[PDB]
Design a protein around this ligand. Sequence first.
Ligand SMILES: Oc1cc(O)cc(/C=C/c2ccc(O)c(O)c2)c1
Ligand SMILES: Oc1cc(O)cc(/C=C/c2ccc(O)c(O)c2)c1
Ligand SMILES: Oc1cc(O)cc(/C=C/c2ccc(O)c(O)c2)c1
Ligand SMILES: Oc1cc(O)cc(/C=C/c2ccc(O)c(O)c2)c1
Ligand SMILES: Oc1cc(O)cc(/C=C/c2ccc(O)c(O)c2)c1
Ligand SMILES: Oc1cc(O)cc(/C=C/c2ccc(O)c(O)c2)c1
Ligand SMILES: [Co+2]
Ligand SMILES: [Co+2]
Lengths: 497, 497
Amino acid sequence: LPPAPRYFQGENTAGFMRPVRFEGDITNLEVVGEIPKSIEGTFYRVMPEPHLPSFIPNDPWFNGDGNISGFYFKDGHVDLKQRYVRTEKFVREAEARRSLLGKYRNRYTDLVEFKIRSTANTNIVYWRGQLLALKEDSPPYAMDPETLETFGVYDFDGQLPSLTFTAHPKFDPVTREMVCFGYEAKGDGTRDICYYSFGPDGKIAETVWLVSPVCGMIHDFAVTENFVIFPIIPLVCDVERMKQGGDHWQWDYSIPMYIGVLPRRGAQGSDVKWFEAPHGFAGHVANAFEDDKGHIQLQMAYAKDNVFFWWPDANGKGPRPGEVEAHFANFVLDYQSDKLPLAEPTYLVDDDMEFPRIDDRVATRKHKHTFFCIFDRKPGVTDFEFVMPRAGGGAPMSNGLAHLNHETGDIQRYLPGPRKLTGECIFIPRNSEAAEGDGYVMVLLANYEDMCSELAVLDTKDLTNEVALIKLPVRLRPGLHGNWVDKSDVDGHPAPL
Amino acid sequence: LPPAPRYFQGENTAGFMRPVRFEGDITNLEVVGEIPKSIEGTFYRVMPEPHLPSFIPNDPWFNGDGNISGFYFKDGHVDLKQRYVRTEKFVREAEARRSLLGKYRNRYTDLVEFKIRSTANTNIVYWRGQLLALKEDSPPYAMDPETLETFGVYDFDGQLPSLTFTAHPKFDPVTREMVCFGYEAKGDGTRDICYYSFGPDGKIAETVWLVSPVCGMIHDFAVTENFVIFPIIPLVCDVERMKQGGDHWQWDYSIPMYIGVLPRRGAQGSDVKWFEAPHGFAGHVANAFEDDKGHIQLQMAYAKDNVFFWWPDANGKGPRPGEVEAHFANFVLDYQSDKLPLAEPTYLVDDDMEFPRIDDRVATRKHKHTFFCIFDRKPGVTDFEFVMPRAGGGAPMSNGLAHLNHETGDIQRYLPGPRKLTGECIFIPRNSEAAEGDGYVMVLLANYEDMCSELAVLDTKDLTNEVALIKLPVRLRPGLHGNWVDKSDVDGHPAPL
Ligand SMILES: Oc1cc(O)cc(/C=C/c2ccc(O)c(O)c2)c1
Ligand SMILES: Oc1cc(O)cc(/C=C/c2ccc(O)c(O)c2)c1
Ligand SMILES: Oc1cc(O)cc(/C=C/c2ccc(O)c(O)c2)c1
Ligand SMILES: Oc1cc(O)cc(/C=C/c2ccc(O)c(O)c2)c1
Ligand SMILES: Oc1cc(O)cc(/C=C/c2ccc(O)c(O)c2)c1
Ligand SMILES: Oc1cc(O)cc(/C=C/c2ccc(O)c(O)c2)c1
Ligand SMILES: [Co+2]
Ligand SMILES: [Co+2]
């Protein structure tokens, strides 16, 4: 077999990116300042964190075993619980005490035959009394919200119609539906998209099979009152390339950024329209909604080149690390239009941004508040001389958060400091009567001075000020998505506005 | 109540002394080099690690909640399990989410009435299928060796005759007895010493009540074939001082270092003889044995002033941090002698030393190998400019290990490096046929460059060379005692030579 290394090597596991691989508890976390005593609930987040050194050199960040953090808040106190998802990969590798799964989404490089290749490392959501640990090549893994025990692969009581479940389902605050899809829904290289939804009682509602023009990466999607929308990243899969040991994904400069629009209820596969946005990278969706004219306003991060630069085109063409900016774009779509090409989007702010969150009490409807990560290259904002030698590689960088008020155009910016970077934030309603976007924001910080993690708590009334700073004595490696589950929400999701 | 701080403050919890307070698992630790594949068993160690910030300012290191580490070795692989002892203190403070126990060994400063005040933080030994977490003011807490679950206060099936159980019981490799004592055995300030022992079947054997000339700290003791020996540190307890909120311990410059000798079997309390060594600090016992003439050779660390300088004399007089050195002393005692004053000891090496270990297969008999911590002030051995600002305070420093061959007088020194310090080592027999002192030594390192801990594995054939260096991505705070439990030993203790 390829040799199993006994310590981590390479930039993707150096410095702050070095795996810690701890599971367990740290109660009564140290707090500077004061956590508002009315906050009650749990911040769950997932990070890729390789449990064993890979036999693949420079294995991408996205291929790391999912490790779940829960920060449990009550009466101004907070406890951390941490546990790896017990995926097939995790368990078999733990038994063997070495890596067995090979290249990202390339089963032909695996040392044993896996049934499920999930690292369950991308998102962690709450649904009907369970956590679901998500990875877009796989079904969810169900977990206990209190103990973080893994129950196993979750197939929604045998109803799951797809081999794949997106990392970005949307929760309709009015209907209480979980709206879902999977791409490559019939396996590697398939152009099949399965769109499906579940009512609050757990029963499957929609199931529509449609066909993508290319086998392209559909990382995120959007949902409005009457439509679902599928933006395709111009990374394309060829299984023949994979069989020869090549990458699952390869950029294609010759295609548009497709944006599929399908009626949300009662559609057939052939009802999809594949609009063609200017070539670019489909970043995360803030939210979409239908305006007065019935046109879809799709607000999302959007770049003009390949953000995943480690997967270049067939001739190795692509950007360098740190080159590509994504901007907060607004695309207008009209399902009734027979014109497929779309105009360049308008931009809501100038910042290089990503990881947008809204008040999910208005998800799928008109929103007027967005919170997002920013990367400001202005001299001094980040002390690169100090940070970069300690940072390692393979993950995106954020040196602040921003809050945009869409009505007034006002922006507040939170800068944690010159030697700190941020993850994706969460928004917490102040209480059940709070106006849209009014409450608290939390975000995990990487502190490169201490080489420790911190959890910052902000009040939306003044995003520049930390109300509390929770000081972890360990590192939580840079992660992907996370969610707030408020104690006052019986089904884990906030009530509609 | 006195205010409960929400983060740690003061030198005793700064830098590398900052509590981490993690409990859980880190499997498949990173290894540089190669752990010998034939090593099979577990290294257990205990550290004081406050679970909650103290309401006592500059609370001594010795008053921190006991946290148990287990390093489980097999086939060249190693896993860490870590868990706090569930003492009465730990549980009640966890329930309250604040500190309740007050000053070290002073119940009159507690905010609630405790039955047991143990932090179980000083030693962790194996006995008849359980771990015993030891603290000299208390009975042991029994724990599961595999899971580190706490069973509870242990009273040896109702046989324990004493309120107190030493942190330093001895295991007779021939008789398989556990030889024990407790001082202040009838409560705070009492001069009662209870000497007691247990046969390998768990039945109590000896129980002798004797009387100390002063109520002094007896941290360690020695056992030979026919005698038990009690060296008294000139720290003295006055309960009236404690009732007014004062320290349990106060140095007394006017008294000798008493060394009590009692017949090991069948004695009465009045058979003890209180020999009087020159004034000084009774450090840890390497081992004691009877020579050809039946004279006791007692080998122990010995200082000429108060190592515990934070507990000075009645007028506040004593040494500064880092001033007092301890030396490896040999005291000769003759039980038949009626002359109480003893001569100054001879010294086996010149190093400032402590924490001596022998091959416990010859415990209570003649030994010819000792392994010990050293602190070498020779320029360059420790980079103090770098280390001291990161070190915090309250714990002793060791910048190497030494191996003395007592026959040849040869010494080997292991220096982990200029920016690393060590804990107490353990010795592992190479195999069941190994000669005395032949095998492996392990020791936990504090790495001040990385602010991480490491576990070094050494071969006794060349102590200067690390065969393996196990790299932890967290800190294990400086700790107290630890023990090896070999998988090949049915009762957890090695067979006699
Ligand atoms: O030694 C083996 C061989 C094998 O062929 C399969 C397994 C385990 C499978 C598995 C374990 C845990 C999971 O959560 C899961 O989805 C699958 C273990
Ligand atoms: O910084 C960004 C921006 C973005 O728009 C998307 C991602 C992540 C996508 C992803 C895709 C596939 C995976 O398997 C996975 O773990 C993550 C990261
Ligand atoms: O060797 C390096 C150094 C570095 O500073 C950054 C990267 C990668 C950047 C990146 C990784 C993942 C993403 O999802 C993304 O948007 C950006 C790689
Ligand atoms: O008056 C009280 C109130 C309380 O809330 C708890 C206790 C004791 C708890 C305890 C728990 C575990 C132990 O091992 C132990 O010795 C004691 C006593
Ligand atoms: O550096 C040294 C040298 C020594 O000879 C003894 C000790 C520790 C003794 C101790 C005494 C009472 C306690 O309660 C405790 O946790 C520890 C530390
Ligand atoms: O507040 C402080 C500051 C400091 O710089 C050092 C100490 C303690 C040192 C120490 C020295 C020798 C020992 O055996 C021991 O247990 C502790 C305490
Ligand atoms: Co995403
Ligand atoms: Co000791």
